[model samples]
Target: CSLIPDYQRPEAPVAAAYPQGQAYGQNTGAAAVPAADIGWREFFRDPQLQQLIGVALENNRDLRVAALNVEAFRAQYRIQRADLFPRIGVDGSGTRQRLPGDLSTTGSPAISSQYGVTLGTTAWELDLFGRLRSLRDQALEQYLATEQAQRSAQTTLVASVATAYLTLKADQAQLQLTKDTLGTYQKSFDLTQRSYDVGVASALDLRQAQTAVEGARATLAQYTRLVAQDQNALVLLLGSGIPANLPQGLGLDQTLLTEVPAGLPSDLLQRRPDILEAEHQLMAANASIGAARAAFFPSISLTANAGTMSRQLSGLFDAGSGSWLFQPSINLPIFTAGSLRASLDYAKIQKDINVAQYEKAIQTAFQEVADGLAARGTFTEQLQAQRDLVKASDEYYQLADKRYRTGVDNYLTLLDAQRSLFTAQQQLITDRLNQLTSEVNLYKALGGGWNQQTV
Candidate 1:
C-alpha cells in the first residue's frame, strides 16, 4: 500500500564552521543557537533600532507574518485538510407542481406538494485509492514550507534595514567633517587674498587658499547629496513616511561585540526557508506520484443521500415518507496509449528537479556565510589601518600649518598635509560603514537576524 520512495536528506560539500582558519575573523562556528534563536532582545540592545526595524517590517509585514506565524500555518492545515473526511451541511427545498391530466399517473388534473430537509456530505471524494488523502498531506508540508520562507525574507529585511540606517549615520559624520574643513579653508582664503592685494604674497599663494576652500565646497556638496539620498532611501524602507521619533542608534563598534551566536552547522542550510520550500515542493510532487501511480490501477467514487420525502406539506415528517439513496462507482483505466505510465514519470521528474534545487540552496547559503566570515576578517584589519592613517595625517597637518605660518614651509606643504587629513577622515568613516554593514550581513548570512517574535 505504501508508494512513496523513502526520502532521506542529501549530503553537501560543507562543514559546521568556516572550512579555513580565522575566515578573516568571521564565523567561529560554534554549537550555539545561531542568530535566529539568539532570542529577540538579545539580538540588539538598542531599542530604537528594534523599533525602527518594526517600521520597516510594517511595509512588508504580510510576508514575514506568513513565515513566522506558526499558529496560522497549523490552523490552515487543520481547517482545509480536515475536509478529506465527511462534512455535514443541512439544506431544504420545497416544490409545488401541477401536471396535465393526460400526462399524470392519476389521469386527472394532478397536483403535488413536496418539502423536506436533511444533512449529509456533498460531492466529497471517498479516497478509495488515497488520492484525496495524498493531496491533503501535500498541503500540510506546503504550509510549513511557506512558514520557513517567511523567516528568510524577514531576517534578510532586518539586516538590510539595519545596514541602510547606519550608513546614513556614517554620512552624517562625514558631512560634519567636511563643513569643518570648509570653515578652516575660508579663513585661509581671506588672509592669503589680503596679502596678495597688498602685494606681499604671490598670486600662487592666494590661488592655493582658494583651491582648498573650493575643494572643501565640492566635498560638502557631495555629502549633502548623499544625505538627501540616504534619508529618502531609509524613509522608503520604513513603509512610507520617515520615522517620527527614533532613538539614537547603537554605536557602530558596540554592535560588533554584541555577542552573536557562532555560525550554525552547514546542514542548517537545508532548513533555510528557500530550502524548505524546495523540499516541501518535492514532497508535494512525491505525493502527486501516488495519484499518478494509482491511476494505473483503479478509481472509485460514492454518492449517498438519506432524507425524507413527503407528497404533502402537512405530512413532510410522516413515518412512512422517509427515503434513502446510495450510489457508488469505479473507473478502470485499461488503455490510454501509455498515458498513466508517462504521468508517473512526470511526477518523478518534477520531484527530481526540486531535489536538485534543495541541494543548490544549501550550497548557496553556505557560500554566503563563508563570504560574510571572510569579509569580517578583512574589514577589522582594514579599519585599524585606516585609523592609524587618520591619526598620522591629522598630526602632520597640524605641524605643516604651524610650519607655514612661521615662514618655515610653503603653502604647497600645508595644502598636501591638510587635504590628506580630510581625505583620511572620510576614508575612515567609510571603512566603519563597511564593517557595520558586514555585521548585518553576517547576521543575514546566518539565516536570520532575530527571533520570529517580531521585527
Candidate 2:
C-alpha cells in the first residue's frame, strides 16, 4: 500500500489563444511544423553559423556542466532506489575469555572460547507503508527535472551563439559603411581646400567641409573598434578561435529565416524545457508529501542472520554448530508531541510552493512567446520603412551636393544633407540587424534550436 496522493496536472492557467494587436501579424496561423520540429540545422541554414553552433555544443563549458549535473542526479536517484532492497553483508567474529576460580561453578579456574560467522542485513526498512518507495519516486522526479534543465541550457546556448555571430556580422558591415563615407568626406574636404586657395570658396566653407571629414573619421574609428570587440564576443561564445576555411558569412538580413510561426500558447507547455522542468519539480514535491504522510504510520524494519557458531575455531564448520538470528522491529508513533503533523504540513506547503512556481513558469513562457510574435510582426515593416528612408536620404544628399556646387545653395545645407544621409544609412543597418535578431529570439522563445531535425 502507498500513502502517496494521486496527482493531477494543474490547468494551464493561461489564455487559449495568443493576444492580437497591430504588433501581431495578421498572418498568425498554426505552422504545419512547430519551431521545435524545425531544429537548429534547418532554421540556421547559414553554413558559418551552423558550424559555430556545432562547435559551441561540443565545447561550451555551461552545456558540459549541465550534462554532468544530469549524470549526478541520475546517480542520486539510483542511490535512493537502492534503499528499497536489503543490503546484506558477510561478517565474522571471535572472542575468548578467562574466568577466575570464584566465578567457576566447580570452584576452579576455567577458560571459555566462542567463534561465529554470519551473513546478515541490519535494520533494513520493510517499506510496508511505501515510505521508501515515495522517496525513490521523489529522487526519480528530481533526475527528470534536471534533465529538462539541461535541455533549457542547451537551447539558451544555441540562441546566444547565433545572436553573437549576427552582431559581429552587422558591426562589420557598419564599419565598411563608415569607411566609405569617410573616403567621400575626405575627397570633399580636399576639393574645398583647393577652392579656398584659389579665392573662390570662403574660409568658413572650407572649415565646414573639414568638420564633416573629421566627424566621419571619428565615426570610422568608433565602428572599427566596435567591429573588433564584436568579433571577440563571438569568439568567446564559440568557445574557440574562428576556424580557417569556414564558409563565407552571410549578411544579417540574409542570415536567418524570414518567418517562423508562433504556434499557440498551449504549445509552450510541451515545447519549453523550463516549463517542463518546473512541472517535474512540482511532481517531486508531490512525492515528498507521500513520504511525509507515510511517517504517521508504524514502520517495520528487519535484521536477520544465519550462520555457524562454536567454542573452538575448528568446530565452527562442524554439523551441530549451526546458529541463526531473526530480529524484526516495529516503530509506532505513540506520543510524538506534534513533529509528524509539522512534517506533513511542511511537505504539503512545499508542494503548494512548487505548484505556484510551475504555473508561473507557464505564464513567463506565454509572455515570451507573445513578445516574440509582436516583434516578428513589426520588425519587417519597420525595416522596409528604414530602407526607404536611406534611399531618399541618399538622393537628397546627391541633389544637395549639386545645388551647392552650382551656387544654388549654401555649404551648410549640403553639410546637413550629408549628415542626414550618413545617419539614415547607419540606422538602416541597425534596423536590419534588429529584425534578424528578432527572428532568432522568436525561434528561441518558441523552443527551437535544441533539436537538429533532418527535415
Candidate 3:
C-alpha cells in the first residue's frame, strides 16, 4: 500500500568512450589497475605526501562539517521511522476534595480521595497506506546522500593537498635555479668591469654585463617571494605549519603514480561519490512524492488505555477497580483550498529538478575524466620535447661562451645565449610540474583517492 512512483535511472548523457585523436595520443602504457581499486596510500607512494594527506583528513573543518551533516540526517531518519509504531506511555492522576454537610453523601462534611493510572498509547498513526514508510524512506535517502557528500569532500581534500605540496616543490626548484644563474651573472659582471678598465672590453660590453646581472637579481627576488607564497598556500591546505619531522618529499616528477588507467565512462556512475550523492538526492525526492500523495487519503489514529482506579489507596488493585479506554479516529478531507493538490505537484516538480541534477552530475564527471585522459595522453610527448629544448639551450650557451672568450664572437651573442638558456630552463621546470599535476588530476578524476575493495 505504497504511493511511491517507480523510479528508473536516467540514461547517461555522454559518449560511450572518451574522445581519441592526435591530442589524445594512442595508448601504449595504460595501467592494468583501475584507479578505483587503487587507494591513496598505494597511488601516492611518497612518504611525506602521504603524511600530509593523513593530517589533513584528521583536521580539515569542511570535511568535519560534512560528517556532522550526515549524523543529523541519520537522527532525522530515526525520528521519522519511529512514527510507524505506537508510542505507549504511563500516566497517573490523583484528586482530593472537601464536601459540605448538606451536599455530601454522609450526614457531616467529609474528605475524599481517588487515584487512577493508565498505561496506553497516544494518537499513533497506522501505516495502512505506507505514509509513514515513505517519510522514513525519504529521510533515509537524505542521510545516505549526506554520507556520500562526506566521501566526496575527502576525495577533493586529498587531491588539493597533493597539488599544493607539488606546487611548493616546483617553486623551490625555480628559486634555486635563479640563484645559480644570478651567481654566474655576478661573476661575469666582475670580469667585464675588470676588462673595460684595461681597455680590452668596450663600454657597451660592460653595460650589457651590468644589465644581465641586475635583471637576474630582479628575477631572483621574484622567485624568492613565489617560494614563500607557495609555502603559505601549502600550509593552509595542510591546516597547520609544515611538520619538522615530515619525511623528505620526492621531486615533482617522482611523486605520483606513473600510469593511471581511464576505465569506461560507465564506471564513473559507480565510482564517483558526487554522482552517487546526486542519485540519492533524486531517490529522496521520489520518496517525497509518495509521502505527499498519501496525504490526500484518509488517516487512521488509534489510542488504547488499560489501568485501575479506586477511592481508597489500598484498593488501587482491588477487584472490580479496573479501567480501560479505546479510541480510533479517521480524518477524511472533504474540501481544502487545493493545498493538497499543490503539495503533490510541488513534490513531483522537485523530483524533476533532482532528475536534471543527476544527469548534470553524470555529464560533469564524464567531462572531467575525458579532460584528464587527454592531458595524460599528451603530456609524455610534451615533456620529452621540453627536455630536449633545455639540453639544446644548455649546449648553445656553452658554445657561445667559448666563442666570446676566444674572440670569435661578440659579447652580445654570448648574452643572447645566456638569456635563452635561462628561459628554457625555467619553462622546463614548469612543464615538469604540469605533467606531474596531470597525473594527480587523472587520479582524482577517476575517484582513486579513497580506499575501496573491488567486487
Candidate 4:
C-alpha cells in the first residue's frame, strides 16, 4: 500500500466580489453602532415592557427550542471531541454448544462451555497525517456555529416580543382616538337633525351630518377590531392566553432615549449573531476540506484484545487460561471510479458556498442598518406633519359646523370639513404607527439587546 501519494485538488473558484461605493440612501451623518454592548434593559426602559420581555424570554416556544438546540450541539461536541482520544471498553461473553458423536472413537458425545472477558482499545485509527485533528477542528467549528445560531434565535425572539408589544399599545391608543372622534361626530349629527326638524337646516345638511357620523362610527369599529387582533398577537408571543390582569399601558408618545450611543460599523460584523454563525459555518466547511483531502491517504488502525478464557468455571481467573492478542491494519484507497476525488470537490464547493454566504450576510446586515438610519428622520418628519394636519383639520371642521348652523355656509362645505377631519385623524394614527415601527426596525438593525446569558 502506498503510504504517501501526491494528491492535487482542483482549485475551488472564489465568488465574485460585491460592488462597492453603492450606498443605499443611508444618512452619512448618523454613525454606525455596535449592538452587543447594549443591554435589553437599557434599550427598553418601560418597566411593563421589560417585564413582558422577561416573561417571553423565559417561556416563548421559539426561545425554548433554541435553548434545546444549544444543549444538543453541546452533547454532539462532546461526542466529536471524544474521537480524538483512544477508547477503552470491557467485553464479556459466554457460549455453550453440544455436538453428536460423528467422529466417534475419541468423541462419543461432546459438550463444551466457554467464557471470556476482554478490555482494550479496539480499532483506533492512528493520526499519522492529522486526519483526526481536522475532524476535531470541524466539529469544534460546528459546535460554535450552533451556539451562534442560538444567539441569533434569541435576538429574533426579543425583537419579535418588543415589536408585538409596541403594536398592541399603538393600536390601543388609536382605538381611543377613533372612539373620541366618533363621539364628537355623533353630537354634530344630532344637532343637525334637530335643526332640520325645526326648518333651520336644509335636508342636504342633515344627510351630510348623518353620513359623517356613520363613517366615523365605522372607523371606530375598525380600530376596535384591530386592537383585538394586536392583543391576540401579543398573547401568542407570550405563549399564553390574554391575562385577566393586563400590564400597564405604554404611552405612545413616550420616547426611547435619543442619546443612544452607536459604536463603530465594523463592530456590527462581530456583534450580529447571524453573521457570527455564518462565519463559523464557513470555518467548519474549510476544515471539512482538510478532512476530505486526508481521505486520499492511507489509514492505519490498531486494535488489541486482552482477556482470560477458560473452559471450567473455577479456572476463569487462572493465569493458565489468560489470552491476549494485538492486531494492526492499514487501508489505502487505490481507485473508486473518481469517488474520492468527487468527495474532495464537494467539500471544496461547500467551503466556497459558505464563504459567499458569509459575505452576503455581512452586506445584508449593513443595508438593513442603513435603511433604518434613513427612515429614522423621514418618519419623524412625516409624524410631525401628520400631527399638524390633524390640528388644522379639527379647527376647520369646528368652524364649518358653526357656520352651517348659523346659515353662513352650505351643507357641501360642512361635508368637506368633516371628511377632511376624519382623513387627517386616520392619517395621523398611521404616521404614529409608522414612527413606532421605525424605532423597532432601528433597534433590530443595530442588533440591540438579546445577549444576556441564561444559565
Return the TM-score for each candidate structure: 0.84, 0.93, 0.88, 0.86
Q: What is the per-residue lDDT of model 3 for residues 353-444, given as tens digits with 9 covering 90 to 100?
A: 99999999999988888788788778889889888988999899899888876779899998998899999889988988887777887788
Candidate 1 vs candidate 3: which has greater TM-score?
Answer: 3
Report lDDT (CA) for all predictions: 0.73, 0.87, 0.85, 0.74
Task: Compose the digit string of candidate 1's lDDT tens values, residues 320-427.
Answer: 877766777777887799888888889889888878878787778777767766776688788899989989998898998788767788889988997899888899
lDDT by residue (1-455, candidate 4, tens digit) is 21222332222232222112332233234344445656777777676777777778887898788888878877877887788677999978788877778843456787778888878888788887667777777788788998888877877777788888877777777788778878888888888888889889878778778888888788788888988998888878888764555557457777743334344456566678888888888888887777788888888899988888888767888877888878999999998899999998898899879878887787787766656655664777677888898899989988987888788979888889878877887677667766666666666666656654211
Tens digits of per-residue lDDT, candidate 2, 326-415, equal: 999999897889999999999999999999999999988888888877887788788888889889888999998898777788999989
TM-score-superior candidate, 1 or 2:
2
- Candidate 3 to native Cα RMSD, angstroms: 4.0
Error of 2 at 238 (Å): 2.0
Lowest lDDT block of 10, candidate 1: 255-264
List the candidate numbers ranked by lDDT, top first.
2, 3, 4, 1
Q: Which sections of candidate 2 miss by over 4 Å?
A: 27-29, 94-115, 310-319
Deviating ranges (above 4 Å) for candidate 1: 15-17, 21-29, 55-82, 87-123, 240-248, 253-264, 309-320, 407-409, 452-455
lDDT of 3 at 395: 93
